[PDB]
């Protein structure tokens, strides 16, 4: 049982996680076998040549964010560790590259420090370096007006594949870079001119990042100072003529008015070109460079809008048809009124185009017919446009800062088929022609359309094979038992955040339409504040697997004088996961709890106000693996759980007021694998494989020693976060983990 | 201050407020001199003939919401009170109208009870009744399928001016109503037919409410069961022929397809007609009845839309020009695409039309020229339409439930002149032609337009005389010192909830444009999360009276390493009211606090996390009347406040961790009128006119008795919620108010 580091097996080596544990120095109680040590987010201030004694087998050390004054690393502190490959020293307030680093180093990271001098003394001996990260060092500091890069400091590094000097005031591409380089990151370097010579010899390079050099300002979470007179980056005609291996060019936020087609003459393999936050409305219209990119897969031209120009049409060159390899186009924030069928003629041939991103263009009209003309289109993303009803009579320094990195559409949605995201549009009601002349849509997002309409069950007729449907953040009036019945194939329905009309007494609430879905698996009714239904008072489905019922008023339903809702969930005969969280429940009528489906594997009733829980009733739930009761006001446990369940694997009781464990509890219940008793009022204790106890106010006075014995006996039971299992009393202990006491 | 009722003198009579004080029975410690007694929101269950013994001067009793099983009122319990005019008995669970009520009664209220029988025995003796309220009695109850109204039960009441039977299952207008009736309220009564006879003799009537009878459902906070086959209310041809005095007709939510113009034949004075939540798209187009309303001032036709119909145009009859007296038209929720100049020709003549309400119509285009064709138009309300950028050219049972009762536009805005509310529209940027062909606008609402634009100071050129401007709930990029400079004459600016771009480092933040406003009085920057400005680091104005700076990051600004923001507010030389609430302040640098304007009358720093407050620095603030420090983490008071201020009138210190009052604090500071020490950690105490102490964990052990003396001596000092000034200790006291102890016999230990 390791302290204070949770030591774990990974492939063919032993990892130590000692992150975020208030450690004031490198623990010397680290396993002899360990090869990778994480000490990030701690309060360590000193690293001596004695800090890693008896640990010669370390290949990786992480010391990032230490402390939370500065980190003091002595000369040749690591030099003894002859097998050290990966050394991470980020956000340590380091004033110089620590001297005497081990020549075995392949990956060094010094991001977010006060390193102004990049010296031969520091790194020229590190001739095994593959990856060097030096970003965020001389970045808008008043002490340092330019990073000092000793001449030829990198040329000895003939194994260096990745160099990163992003977010440093360089002003000039450093000379004498090693030919070995595959990826050169120079984003936000204040480099305004790129010469013929700058990237000479770099004939192996696959990625170049010149982003944020002469920036166009928009939404960056770091400072944005445009080049004087809004001037673009000046890139010589031939600067990239020897870069024949380049796959990834990032020119985001360089204020480019014109793109020289010469730049791409000897670059036949370019796969991903990033042109976000430039002034290229012209070049998108009459693009020379579009002919030079036959192998391009990802193009991004987002936020190239002309300030104040709301053109009627988007002007797209016919040359866009010479992007034969294109898989994904990103045309966000161009800002235009209408997309005509003809405007997108150039794109209809491209055999591999799967993703069109027209987000944040404030488009009013789209000839939706034009989306049938596309071979392998999987993702139509139109979020933040102005599609009306149709009737017609603090940040991650490692992130990609200029590109949408996460999926445009939830993978769980896209999985089903062609995905259409019309979220944050103006479809205030679904018009009769709303989805006419549309491919077979599988995945549809109508989230946040200020839609507050009634559903007759004839809105989705033109796209009847929708499987995943998001109607979240609307004010839909569920006034009709026919609502959504036209969608027979439907498997996932998200009605989250439609509370408006569910709160209103002067309108009926019909949820019977659920019953008509033979294929429906997952229904989300979170945050609808449901307090009544009319006519049919039970939810019923033979198919449904998961119901989210959180943020509703079961408190009101299960306290109906005529017990109308006592079996609201029973008719869900195939339900395995039910979420009753945030329903303001104080007491659950035994009858009502006994009418929860017998099929339940996983029941969440967390974040209510339960004082009592009739453990007896678990007898009626023989498939129940997981019970979540966290964040209630529970006081009492059964003292005979074994009599009530043979099924229960995981029991979560975090954030209750439990002060005493029954004598026969921890022992017995052979099914129980995971028990969570963290953040309770346990003063002392007095098969399983995880036991959480952190945040309990333990009396550390001899009586505890009995439990401390049991921890040493049962080592198979993982007690996580031992650092946070603290003594409340007595006064001299108030602070120590309960693994610090003696026996006297 | 009598216990437990706060007695107050008002216009030669004494009111007793004993509401919301957990009283389990009528207190017998009420002054004989009292004329009005409020006992609402208590736990009283019994009213006997001994409940108000003496107390002969009582004219008004309020017993509403008592308790929170039922209220038990004995026969002739009030009969002794020979001067009882107003008796309020609302939400008491009463099973019958209490027998033997006093004949002196003029106003009786019995709303929200279980009164199924309206008997002659109960009310026929009450021949002085002006106002009887019986709403919400037999309302969707399973015991009672109809209210039983004894025949002729009201006809003895020849003084009855107001009768209310709203929200009761009647099914038929009761017969034999007194001719004295001025206002008859029959809303949600389930009355489907109205006969010639029903309102015969009611020749004095000024108001009739038939709303909610055959309802159209939309947003009502009470049940809505439409008449079978969506049938409208059936009102006979001549039902209103004797109602020549009627001013107010309410036909809201009666599902009316057709409005018989006969109804208004002998009704020449009708002032206010309410037709919300009907099916009158036709009648608005044709409209016989429009010729019959020469004196109408308020018409409301809101929510008459045809479900699913998004017509290109609104069809209003030419007859709308025969509404000569109209002051306000309410056409919400008709739902149409375009308003053309000619669509509103019939309204342009009407000499007195001041308010057009086109809310929630989802209009895409408006010929804004057409609003110059109006004589006395003061309010153009277009909230919740779809006006795009232009580039080319627990409820209140007493409420009015079917009408917008509050002002369409904040009075503070309208006051300045012609008001245009484009809130909750689609003006994502202000186009160059956005406010062209528009009257002289004084008051402009652009709130919640998903507007996320840069301002060049050329957007408002076409309406340069805007005085009140609301830009709230947008994502405006204040990246320009020229922003809004075209609006000279500007007095009020609301920039509340525009935090988006103020949180973003990769954008400049210019607030210099304030300086260019010679007339600017009130500036609201609430909830903008301001943590930096570029170039100009101080706010400066010779004119500004009020700055709201709440929900910003003064924590970050006043902890700038180079002290850039130390005098951010000093250049506001005329400022009297400053709000620093919700700025996450733990400590205020003495320099920074000393650079707050000297002109400050009223400083709010509530809801921060302050541990310390240098009371000394108040010396530099000689005009300071009101200091709000509530909801901080303060521990200490000055012990010599008098040395630091002669100005301070109101000091709010609720929700701190203050555990001791200095001996010389309460005494001294003759200016102090209101002191708030509620919800602190005071164990004991040891000019003014209000002192709040409720929610302190008081030791009720002899030491307290000193204070209890001081309360009896200084009776002028109102201590509100004495009921909630509770003993924490010792164990035997934990629950009693500190006015329940005996000074003769207490304990000394348990400290
Ligand atoms: C079908 O249509 C008809 C209309 O054609 C509707 O009938 C109306 O119904 C409403 C709602 O019940 C009635 O309003 C009530 O009227 C009371 C009398 O008001 C008048 O006298 C006072 C002077 O004493 C004036 O001030 C009023 O004018 C305005 O004055 C100020 C603004 O300057 C406002 O405060 C007023 O609201 C008026 O706009 C009138 O000339 C009125 O007192 C009563 O007010 C209570 O509720 C309001 C808001 O909730 C509070 O401001 C107020 O405080 C009252 O409530 C408490 O406060 C007082 C004093 O502090 C206490 O004494 C109370 O006990 C209580 O604790 C209310 O607004 C309206 O009068 C009536 N129209 C006519 C002509 O009769 C039907 O309802 C409609 N049917 C349906 C189903 O909607
Ligand atoms: C952004 O910040 C701004 C400003 O910081 C903020 O806008 C202000 O919002 C506050 C409230 O949030 C407003 O203050 C209130 O104003 C109420 C209305 O005030 C007027 O009308 C009062 C009564 O009207 C009667 O008389 C007229 C004619 O005589 C008659 O026609 C009417 O029908 C009616 O019968 C009137 O009393 C008042 O005048 C007062 O002004 C001074 C104050 O210094 C005082 O000395 C006077 O003696 C007098 O009281 C004014 O003309 C007002 O009722 C309200 O007041 C009280 O009672 C409530 C509780 O019932 C309390 O909450 C309150 O403390 C008061 O005791 C209150 O004062 C203010 O007007 C806004 N300012 C502007 C410019 O609009 C925005 O809300 C912020 N925005 C966001 C998004 O947060
Ligand atoms: C200009 O445009 C260029 C592209 O033209 C762009 O370059 C790309 O930058 C991003 C951001 O730095 C790079 O993304 C990272 O890539 C590495 C390597 O990925 C490969 O290897 C891993 C397996 O090790 C595979 O999963 C992956 O499929 C690739 O084969 C990844 O390590 C990064 O993943 C982590 O970081 C993400 C961002 O924080 C996390 O979300 C993710 O969970 C990973 O973090 C976790 O694991 C990390 C492992 O080291 C660990 O360190 C973290 O703490 C955490 O536990 C990330 O995807 C991308 O590779 C570059 N593209 C190319 C082709 O090289 C520039 O960024 C852009 N310029 C600007 C200024 O934006
Ligand atoms: C309305 O309610 C629905 C139903 O709850 C919500 O949609 C679900 O959201 C949950 C998360 O809250 C989704 O579950 C997550 O899916 C991720 C991806 O799953 C795929 O990949 C995994 C392997 O990674 C496969 O097992 C799986 O078959 C899928 O192929 C997971 O990565 C998520 O976390 C997992 O890993 C972490 C460890 O980091 C663990 O903590 C988790 O326990 C878990 O193992 C997680 O499983 C779920 O897929 C969604 N369902 C559907 C049908 O879409 C909506 O979010 C909700 N709507 C609103 C508006 O609130
Ligand atoms: C510009 O347009 C905006 C957009 O409409 C407008 O904002 C509105 O202002 C008023 C106050 O000035 C808001 O009214 C309040 O809103 C709160 C929200 O929680 C309500 O709780 C309050 O009403 C309660 O009391 C009623 C009593 O019966 C209850 O029935 C009711 O349910 C509430 O509990 C209170 O009225 C209004 O909500 C906003 N609306 C929005 C969308 O922000 C602003 O006034 C306009 N600016 C100018 C200059 O006029
Ligand atoms: C349908 O449309 C909406 C809006 O486009 C999608 O909502 C967005 O979904 C993403 C991913 O779930 C949310 O990302 C989150 O951001 C917050 C940061 O505030 C972070 O806390 C979360 O961890 C997560 O990263 C995003 O906020 C959300 N946007 C809005 C406006 O709600 C929705 O996912 C779409 N549906 C489908 C099925 O694709
Ligand atoms: C009572 C609930 O109403 C919901 C609803 N469903 C539909 I189809 C409509 C509707 C009505 C008129 C025009 C266009 C569409 N409406 C009404 C509005 C637009 C107000 O939501
Ligand atoms: C970064 C600041 O950008 C704000 C801004 N102010 C204006 I005038 C515009 C704008 C841009 C193009 C077309 C129409 C209008 N925009 C940008 C958008 C519309 C994206 O918000
Ligand atoms: C460039 O990479 C190739 C393999 O892709 C390698 O054989 C060659 O040695 C590298 N060139 C230099 C000069 O390091
Ligand atoms: C399209 O991609 C597929 C694999 O997804 C590949 O086989 C095909 O050759 C690609 N075609 C072009 C023209 O890039
Ligand atoms: C409910 O939907 C059905 C089927 O489309 C329709 O005929 C009916 O009019 C709807 N009912 C209501 C109350 O809107
Ligand atoms: C649990 O409920 C059952 C009946 O459903 C009842 O017999 C028993 O009293 C309850 N158990 C506890 C511990 O309250
Ligand atoms: C009101 O009544 C009492 C006796 O009923 C009388 O003595 C008293 O003088 C009256 N109130 C006032 C203010 O005079
Ligand atoms: C109308 O009202 C007044 C009371 O204000 C009364 O004098 C008159 O007689 C009433 N008319 C009838 C017919 O009752
Ligand atoms: C218009 O209002 C004025 C005063 O506001 C009034 O004298 C007149 O009666 C009204 N005019 C008409 C035609 O009703
Ligand atoms: C108040 O501030 C002044 C300086 O402005 C300082 O000298 C004094 O010590 C402060 N008082 C306290 C109690 O901190």
Residue numbers in the entry:
A (entry chain A): 32 to 99, 112 to 436, 460 to 752, 763 to 820
B (entry chain B): 32 to 99, 112 to 436, 460 to 752, 763 to 827
The authors write:
Particularly, human TLR8 mediates antiviral immunity by recognizing ssRNA viruses. Particularly, TLR8 also plays an important role in the antiviral immune response through recognition of viral RNA in endocytic compartments. Previous reports have shown a two-site activation mechanism for TLR8 with ssRNA degradation products.
Aiming to further understand the molecular mechanism of this unexpected, unique, and dichotomous behavior of CU-CPD107, we successfully obtained the crystal structure of the TLR8/CU-CPD107 complex. CU-CPD107 utilized hydrogen bonds with A518* and V520*. The distances between the C termini of the two protomers of TLR8 dimer (TLR8/CU-CPD107, 50 Å) was similar to that of the unliganded dimer (51 Å). Superimposition of the TLR8 structure complexed with CU-CPD107 onto the corresponding unliganded TLR8 segment (residues 32–816) produced a root-mean-square deviation (RMSD) value of 1.2 Å. First, CU-CPD107 (100 µM) alone was titrated into purified TLR8 (10 µM), with no detectable change in heat observed; R848 (100 µM) alone was titrated into TLR8 (10 µM) with an observed Kd of 35.7 nM. These results indicated that CU-CPD107 hindered R848 binding to TLR8, in agreement with the inhibition observed previously.
